[PDB]
């Protein structure tokens, strides 16, 4: 298929950012697209084969490199805040009817690494009314005060990830929708049979995967560094 790398990156304005892409389809053409709201998919660079790179529609700020028939790589020599977007890699045969895309990369170019905050996850137990009116028990999870929106939320009932009766919001919400650096908050749900929630032998856990800094960055604040870790909150039966 097509596996972009890394899937999430946070960087500072002025530094070098190098996205990479590998393919196992024996294709000859590779492309680098960026997706933005109100502007659709845009072509940046592409390559007909190892050794040659051809400019796309928006090649400014990026450089291309096709050192292998399987490898294509972007290069942000001088990063800017205008670059933050979701970048995509693709490929297709010559005269290739179809395009095989990658999974996607979320890039966040920030001016200062100060506003990078991990999330605070909390689980709320269902109201006794819903247990007595609907025979259902809805747990709600809140991950608050995090930046940027590079988070993924999972539930874990009895040590195994669940999907039946689960909901999460489409996109996060800004706590102060007027600041350029407003922290985000995402809400989720989990509904289970009331008789299954009243059994205290079952535990309900709420796990957030945070994508922030890496083990090769410099943290210059009294606060703890916002590395990529797991934030979890758990409740039990009653």
């Amino acid at each position: 298929a097509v596996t972009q790398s890394p899937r999430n990156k946070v960087a500072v304005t002025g530094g070098k950012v190098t996205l990479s892409c590998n393919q196992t389809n024996n294709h000859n053409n590779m492309y680098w697209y960026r997706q933005d709201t109100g502007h659709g998919l845009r072509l940046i660079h592409y390559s007909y084969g190892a050794g040659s790179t051809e400019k796309g529609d928006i090649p400014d700020g990026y450089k291309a490199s096709r050192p292998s028939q399987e490898n294509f790589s972007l290069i942000l020599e001088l990063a800017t805040p205008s670059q933050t977007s979701v970048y995509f890699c693709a490929s297709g045969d010559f005269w290739g009817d179809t395009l095989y895309f990658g999974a996607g990369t979320r890039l966040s170019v920030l001016e200062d690494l100060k506003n990078v905050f991990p999330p605070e996850v909390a689980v709320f137990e269902p109201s006794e009314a819903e247990i007595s009116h609907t025979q259902k028990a809805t747990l709600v999870c809140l991950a608050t005060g995090f930046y940027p929106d590079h988070v993924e939320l999972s539930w874990w009932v009895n040590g195994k990830e669940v999907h039946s009766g689960v909901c999460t919001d489409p996109q996060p919400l800004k706590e102060q929708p007027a600041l350029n650096d407003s922290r985000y908050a995402l809400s989720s749900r989990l509904r289970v049979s009331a008789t299954f929630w009243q059994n205290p032998r079952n535990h309900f856990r709420c796990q957030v995967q945070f994508y922030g800094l890496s083990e090769n960055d410099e943290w210059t604040q009294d606060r703890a560094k916002p590395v990529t870790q797991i934030v979890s909150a758990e409740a039990w039966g009653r």
Binding site: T138, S164, V166, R189, R191, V192
Partner: peptide, 20 residues
Amino acid sequence: ITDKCVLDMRSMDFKSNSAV
């Protein structure tokens, strides 16, 4: 206040909206 959502308890039915 968040946007609507859809919950589908696969076992018993069930389509149920929600908002926190």
